[PDB]
Write a protein that binds this DNA or RNA. Structure first.
Ligand SMILES: Nc1ncnc2c1ncn2[C@@H]1O[C@H](COP(=O)(O)OP(=O)(O)O)[C@@H](O)[C@H]1O
Ligand SMILES: Nc1ncnc2c1ncn2[C@@H]1O[C@H](COP(=O)(O)OP(=O)(O)O)[C@@H](O)[C@H]1O
Ligand SMILES: Nc1ncnc2c1ncn2[C@@H]1O[C@H](COP(=O)(O)OP(=O)(O)O)[C@@H](O)[C@H]1O
Ligand SMILES: [Mg+2]
Ligand SMILES: [Mg+2]
Ligand SMILES: [Mg+2]
Lengths: 48, 313, 309, 312, 312, 312, 312
DNA sequence: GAACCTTCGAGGAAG
DNA sequence: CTTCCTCGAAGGTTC
């Protein structure tokens, strides 16, 4: 799941989130198996 | 009907209200979302309230935000992900959005999906985000500052207009029902005429007349009380303030109509240049009473006949 | 005290004073808060004084700040969070607030709520009923969306000689100085229609009466003091008289340009246009013309020159 | 897609289309990159579409960006460094980028190399970099406002021009078939005339007319239906929009035809003076309705008769 | 010392000196601070000198600063916070303060308090800072540059006027005693009449004459040495400089007295329009040698008899 | 490359080359740099190329920049520090440089030193930078565009003028010989006559004609081929461009032949005044199409007959 | 070296040297610093040169800076802190300093102190910096831009004057010795008459003639070589350029000597209105070739004979 | 009616 | 975001 975990942080940072908060935001997702799309969607959906 | 729900209840704006009805009905005839709409017009005409009415007619929810509230692409993408199929997103002051976000909105409006590129270019990958069908409703007072690519994506243009006497009169009559006061139809017309065509101004006058009627009268706004109330407040039958009359009278009495410089005119009425150019002068031009020329301000023949002075070319 | 505390003590401003009395009584009758009031106009007419009177009449404690003291949105939010039901907030020199602050004031005045980003998160605060009072000399500098939200607009106007005479007599009792009725009128004529100027002249005349007289202002001591100050019976200064005298004697009344006039009297161009000339125009002694400014017949009569059309 | 992909498909622009074909095939005969090309003209005439065609005709990857989208030299340097031999770079609004960015463009166009300043303060040096063979394609809206030293670097100029009625009718027919709508040649002709010679405008009106025909009519775009729809949309029989009618009507009714200054006019109608002068006046002037005069704008006799007002 | 310290030593300015005596004496009897005073007028007439005299006569310490030094509200707040009861604060070139900083003095001068934000974050509060009784003194040459609400708060105004020959003669004699110089009364009057009415100019001339008197003379200033020294400086008995004489001579000889335009005259003398208008023309007009008319500059009869020409 | 490298290759400009030859040869006998040279005249005459020739003749490196590209003194100092002994600095459009930067060159050009403030805060200090010997070459349209203090420091003035048909013909033949192409004298002369007297225009036209002759012809340029190729392009039978055609058409059809103000004309043609002033008007005047009068520009009978209007 | 180092070498400006010598010698006897001095006048007359001479004659080190280098008040304060007792500070182009900084010199020049704000920003107080005895030297081309209170503080004013033929001739000879060239007395006088009374122009002309004489001559400048070099330079025997000759000719040929309005003349000469009035006309009026009149400028008899036409 | 001179007013760009 | 200033217009006089 290193691809989805890293891809989420990589794309989330490209969207303007700070690397620190972007890493925490993705790390906060409980399911590790969540796909890149689900991680990015959940991270953004959970931040608003 | 102060806060309408459907076009059946919305007062005024008949042109835009009639056009939007056809496009919504044609959209409903298909399993499709309404095209992106851009609303134009001066401030305070009711643009925000109109967006809510559109959502009800379409039968979808409305998400409200503003351009200044959007600071990074993540904000817009997060907002969009919260929308459901057909939901409407209303962005006020769309002309103030940061360019860094504008370039992202194009793909969402055109493809309903966003592709983000990551990597060193020597090695890179993309992430595809699919968005539910949505309708964007933009509201802006200034159009020229909108970039051509963004304006090209909007497919429906709606123009707001100042309310006419019959429509503005009804707003006063119905607003008078929120309060416990009774207002005669003839008195409501006098306030509407002086409301400069803006609902917020008509509400302000009604509130002031109410205080007078319940203190200097029997708590009823009749023609007699309205005439007195509109006399304590030095508001002309054309809506000109006491200072507005002083400007025109000074130009006619001392300068024979002009040309006269702003500096000279300001010191005569003992006002600041900024005050005369921003508070009083704008409405006088819309009524056609004065014109701006390279040599200075000049009073038109329409001002002469209104103030009651002889005019000669 | 110098500043009147109630409408029974506040002299003049009939138009503004009469309107405010109606609105305050009506608001009390309904147990509601007064609408947002904006006071504007020339300096020294009583804008700040009226703001305190409004609070004393409503019977509420007045919160006070100023535009220059507020520098960031965080400042205004902290102040607004201190308001209690019915509190009145007075912001003097409101035209100095930054644009980023005025945008926050719209929601508070119209929606009674503020949205604060504060681990980053949004907190929504609900404000109780409150009345904002603003005062400024240049209302045109405020944003157009802000002016539209003020429900009461008070435009201050100059005072008449009978009112200024009553003000001079009132101030004389605070200083425990005896002044005759006709002596008070001599100062009122020279006060240029401004209460602050009337007080300034009284203070200066008092100093003379205490050093050169018996400590009493009378029809005789006033003429001596006014001659030492060199203020004409129309309120013209030594430089004001020199301007009219030069225009009539050297240029036959004009038209004469501002530059030429300034150099001849040995004055800075800015000072003539912004300090001395404004009062001469409003009183009708000078007129601005496309070719220059000219001295009117009123100037010839006052200075004692044979008018030649 | 709606936009054409090859010269055989691109409608109109016979002059520009014929010129480019010769130069494109000539370059292939020599097996070298095409010269720097500049496109200019009114917006929405297909300048971007033409760029995609040129790239397809050349068989080269098209990379797109814009003047305002470039903020610092490092941005343009990164873009140029990622160009493969023969690549085509298309930059819209090339006339609006910052002057500091154009410095890099001059050397890139004149000799395919750039010089980058390095260091700060007491340190001040530079590094020379050479660019591989490539072709620049620029697009502008006011060739008269482009930097003179830059304009002289372009070797090919393409003057885009308004489409004629025989061409716009073909575009409406083409678009109507994609939507599977039924439109008669007479109705398509009315839409073309009132489209102000712009393909983008013709598409906007065609979409809106479709919604009207599907409710007020039987789904067939007849002339009687097309005219009723265009009047509902407030589009004059000459293409003057709602704002255009407001301008001309105001001059005749409030200023007796002028002269009136832009400031007064732009304050009477609630519009920014800059918007009136930049977006609306150009069409009214080209049609001869408004004539700029020392004392202000004046309504010509053509505007009086068109609006139905008796001329003086 | 060069600058007078008390009204006994301050020569001239009768109108201002007489008024300040009454206001200072009256303030002492009531045991209260003097009202706020504004001093303005032409350069070098004694504005700064009077500010120090007021403090000595009141018998209090003087705190000094200048407009150009106060660039932000924090600077002014720190100065006011250091005021003690009865202190006098003098601000020279007060017109340079930024407008946003002047608005802080409004409440300080009338009510002796200022409002300051204190605390941190959501806990911040605005609080009144209360100031003890103090007097603000301002000196400026551009009084018209101050805001109307600020000038209205000054309770005392002093407009400086030029000095007359008897006073300037006494000033030259006094300054001559500061140095080890002996000057005959006849020679002292000779310098006063040429000093254009300004004490600083009278002092400047004395220094230049002294240097000559001790290098090309026996170290004593007499009518003989004064004539030779002033001849080298080329200062006319009316104070006209060399260039000032060149102007009047050209107008009388080439234009017959005028009228002549400033531009034309500037070229003939090889000067420039701005130097003639700002340095030379002002004194020539104020003293009556030149008259400005709609047609141009004209030389008066006074200039003819001074230069030695027949007033035909 | 095409660009000439030595005076043996630079055709024309005899009056300029002859002077530069003398000053350069003399400056080489003495171990010192050449005096600062100012080149001025119409754009595209080859003044930038001349800067390269001087550098090659002197045997030193040439650094290039432009007036509008330098925004603050710090930018210019960074460039001057980067110069090596004897290096040549070329500044295009020097008249357009900001005044804040121009006043820094005064000391650098006359004494080779610059006074600058270095450091920050407590470290701020003044340093007297000493520059090595260098030669500045400036370019401008007219000498009257530069301030007197700057113009006085340039020791050599080079006034450039339009090329004559014999010289342009040789340039076309030279250019056409660098490429593997063949051109007959009649075509070369015809192409030169159409080049509006500017070499930069001649080269661009030759490039397009080469592409046409390879696709639409036998690969050899002949009068008949050049006529057709030039007819396919917008170049008229006497060098008038489409912009030139638009100017005359607007002047005659709207203003009735003038007189018309250049500003009012510019805004109607939608072109910047600088372009008409520096590009179109000079040629139209020197070729007798436009006559300059106190009232404004007036179209001549030659223009009337060229466009085909009735010259009453 | 080119710049004269002492009064013994400084040719001309007798009126200024005679005064400066007395003031410097007087200051040395008293063992004091020289009073603040201002040097002003037309461009290139020797203002900067005299500033270095004053320092050398005083026998003290010179600190140098310039007006445009002082961007903010913090820079000037840092410079003033570096002064040592007796130091001379020279500010070239003093008129370029911003008003906000110029007002800081007022106190420093008259009372040798400066008010400054010091502290942590949160807490701060005003303090007096005490300056040692120093001399300020300023040079400006247009003193009119300096504020009246600043000019009044300069105790010594030096107005530079144009040089005469006898003085300007010696400058040419002196410069030739530095170049090791031999110049005949007749040739030295020829160059002087064409130098427009300005030393910088005389040195520029001499350098161009020197380069010519050693490239196509025996390395000697004689009355015969001067004519050839001056012909190549195209400088008439009166110092007129080709533009100046074109003007005078036009007035006589097309207007019979005038009166003619500048607008009319400008059109015939193809020159910009203000360029004629500000660049070329000033010299022609001072030499007597043109005379401004109420009805326009007229060409005098001197212009007729010089141009060779017959006067009437 | 061409040519000079003085004066005011609204832009616009350099702080 | 603001002050400074310069560009354009026109009234008045004279030959
Ligand atoms: N059609 C309308 N019917 C009733 N009230 C209206 C209408 N339009 C405007 N108003 C009143 O005026 C205000 C201004 O309209 P609104 O939509 O809020 O615009 P904005 O958001 O710019 O203030 C409304 O809040 C309401 O009080
Ligand atoms: N010749 C044409 N044929 C078909 N469609 C065209 C043509 N010209 C323009 N269009 C249509 O109008 C739009 C043109 O967009 P674009 O090429 O970006 O114009 P511009 O670059 O001028 O903004 C597209 O939607 C395209 O399909
Ligand atoms: N005398 C000449 N001989 C050969 N080529 C020339 C000559 N003059 C100019 N050119 C060519 O024409 C173009 C001139 O461009 P450039 O020197 O940059 O003109 P400018 O400096 O005026 O912009 C170059 O391609 C140059 O090689
Ligand atoms: Mg107040
Ligand atoms: Mg002082
Ligand atoms: Mg110098």
């Amino acid at each position: 799941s290193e691809d989805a975990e890293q891809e989420a942080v990589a794309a989330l940072v490209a969207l303007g989130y700070k690397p620190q908060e972007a890493s925490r935001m993705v790390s906060k997702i409980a399911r590790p198996d969540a796909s890149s799309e689900t991680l990015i969607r959940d991270a953004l959906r959970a931040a608003l | 009907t102060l806060r309408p729900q459907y076009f059946k209840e919305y007062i005024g704006q008949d042109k835009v209200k009639d056009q939007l009805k056809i496009f919504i009905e044609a959209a409903k005839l298909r399993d499709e979302a309404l095209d992106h709409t851009l609303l134009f017009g001066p401030p305070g005409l009711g643009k925000t309230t109109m967006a809510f009415v559109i959502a009800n007619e379409m039968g979808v929810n409305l998400k409200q935000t503003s351009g200044p509230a959007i600071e990074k692409a993540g904000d817009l993408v997060a907002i969009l992900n919260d929308l459901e199929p057909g939901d409407i997103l209303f962005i006020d002051e769309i002309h103030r959005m940061p360019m860094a976000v504008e370039e992202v909105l194009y793909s969402a409006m055109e493809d309903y999906y966003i592709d983000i590129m990551i990597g060193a270019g020597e090695t890179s990958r993309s992430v595809h985000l699919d968005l539910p069908p949505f309708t964007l409703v933009g509201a802006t007072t200034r159009a020229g500052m909108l970039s051509n690519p963004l304006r090209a994506r909007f497919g429906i243009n709606g123009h707001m207009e100042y309310y006419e006497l019959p429509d503005l009169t009804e707003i006063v009559e119905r607003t008078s029902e929120i309060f416990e006061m009774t207002i005669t139809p003839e008195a409501a017309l006098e306030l509407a005429r002086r409301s400069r065509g803006t609902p917020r101004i008509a509400n302000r006058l009604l509130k002031r007349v109410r205080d007078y009627a319940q203190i200097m009268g029997d708590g009823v706004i009749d023609d007699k009380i309205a005439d007195q109330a509109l006399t304590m407040l030095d508001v002309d039958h054309e809506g000109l303030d006491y200072v507005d009359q002083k400007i025109l009278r000074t130009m006619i009495e001392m300068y024979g109509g002009g040309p006269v410089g702003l500096g000279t005119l300001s010191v005569n009425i003992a006002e600041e240049r900024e005050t005369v150019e921003d508070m009083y002068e704008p409405y006088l031009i819309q009524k056609g009473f004065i014109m701006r020329t390279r040599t200075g301000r000049v009073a038109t023949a329409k001002a002469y006949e209104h103030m009651g002075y002889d005019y000669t070319r």
